[PDB]
Amino acid sequence: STPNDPRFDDQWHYYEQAGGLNLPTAWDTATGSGVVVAVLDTGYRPHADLNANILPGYDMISNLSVANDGGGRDSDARDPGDAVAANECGTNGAQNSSWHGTHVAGTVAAVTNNGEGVAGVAYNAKVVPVRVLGKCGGLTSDIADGIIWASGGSVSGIPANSNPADVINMSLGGSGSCSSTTQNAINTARSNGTVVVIAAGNDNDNSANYNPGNCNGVVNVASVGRNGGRAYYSNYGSNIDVAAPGGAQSFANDSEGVLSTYNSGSSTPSSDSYGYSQGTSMAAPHVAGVAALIKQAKPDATPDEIESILKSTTRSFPATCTSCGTGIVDAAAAVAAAS
Ligand SMILES: [Ca+2]
Ligand SMILES: [Ca+2]
Ligand SMILES: [Ca+2]
Ligand SMILES: [Ca+2]
Numbered sequence: 001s002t003p004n005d006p007r008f009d010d011q012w013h014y015y016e017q018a019g020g021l022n023l024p025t026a027w028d029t030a031t032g033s034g035v036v037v038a039v040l041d042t043g044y045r046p047h048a049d050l051n052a053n054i055l056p057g058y059d060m061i062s063n064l065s066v067a068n069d070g071g072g073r074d075s076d077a078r079d080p081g082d083a084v085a086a087n088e089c090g091t092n093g094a095q096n097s098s099w100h101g102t103h104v105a106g107t108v109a110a111v112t113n114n115g116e117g118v119a120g121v122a123y124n125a126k127v128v129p130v131r132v133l134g135k136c137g138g139l140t141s142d143i144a145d146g147i148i149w150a151s152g153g154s155v156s157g158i159p160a161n162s163n164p165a166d167v168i169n170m171s172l173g174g175s176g177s178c179s180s181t182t183q184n185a186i187n188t189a190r191s192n193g194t195v196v197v198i199a200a201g202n203d204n205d206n207s208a209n210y211n212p213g214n215c216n217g218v219v220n221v222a223s224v225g226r227n228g229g230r231a232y233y234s235n236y237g238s239n240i241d242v243a244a245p246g247g248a249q250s251f252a253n254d255s256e257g258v259l260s261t262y263n264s265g266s267s268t269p270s271s272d273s274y275g276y277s278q279g280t281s282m283a284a285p286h287v288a289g290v291a292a293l294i295k296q297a298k299p300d301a302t303p304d305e306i307e308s309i310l311k312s313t314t315r316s317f318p319a320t321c322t323s324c325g326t327g328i329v330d331a332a333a334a335v336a337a338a339s
Helices: 023-027 100-109 140-150 180-191 280-297 303-312 331-338
Strands: 036-041 126-131 167-170 195-199 219-224 242-245 258-263 272-277
Touching: 023 331, 036 100, 036 140, 036 280, 100 126, 100 258, 100 272, 100 280, 126 140, 140 167, 140 180, 167 280, 180 195, 195 280, 195 303, 219 280, 219 303, 242 280, 280 303, 280 331, 303 331
Parallel strands: 036 126, 036 167, 167 195, 195 219, 219 242
Antiparallel strands: 258 272
């Protein structure tokens, strides 16, 4: 099926033969109904083309300066904006707000067939926003608590999650080895039945050396462009499980990117928008959305079974993708394999 959203045709990454996810055929069978995806990111804005698919979440950011919302941990996972001034994070230049989590969440589950905006990969799933990134990024320990809570595990001082996730998406990372705090959290999420999907990073380097994609028991995702070959920035290596479209842009908001829900604010939030972004951060929620399609078709699927289905049903690369996992995720084939 093809949705009626007016920007669907701009979302090449869902349907073109070279670099797309092969979604229309998948949507004949699965859309994510009944499945919950936790998006561990900067938070969200209640975009008109997203909010109906948002569930209550949690804000794990403990450092008040990073949190930028007046306090420590709290129940409102909305994104206040992560804009920074020059040298606020050390030696950085000034940066506008990313609205990264709004973009990622829309790839997972933008409201679809509403005649407005964009479509989402798992458009009948629901997203639990777990805010773990703010100004200058996020703390490993807050991210790890996010993983635990998102899965339905217990974190001291935090109310129980009433919407435990089937799938975690982490479009985030840094350099270096996977820490024990992170691996512990991942092990907890997997033991609770939650599959963990992670962006491999954007350093054009060996993915062995970038976390949390280098943790064990995760689905680590490389990025292809619209050509179906490796996006120039994508990490690559033996620990990549699969690839998905993350886009390959040559200027800001280039339509060669991945189009999703977004916000027009430079610092503070403003009007809803749609924007094209790129990264392994954009590839990961494609894969998280397919994991949700799989879980609708196979409700008792384990994390290892979901990873196996994703990896075993990929399609060929039409252009060079060295050490990009088994292939490009093929939503239709994955749903068939889970049915
Ligand atoms: Ca707070
Ligand atoms: Ca908050
Ligand atoms: Ca829409
Ligand atoms: Ca893996």
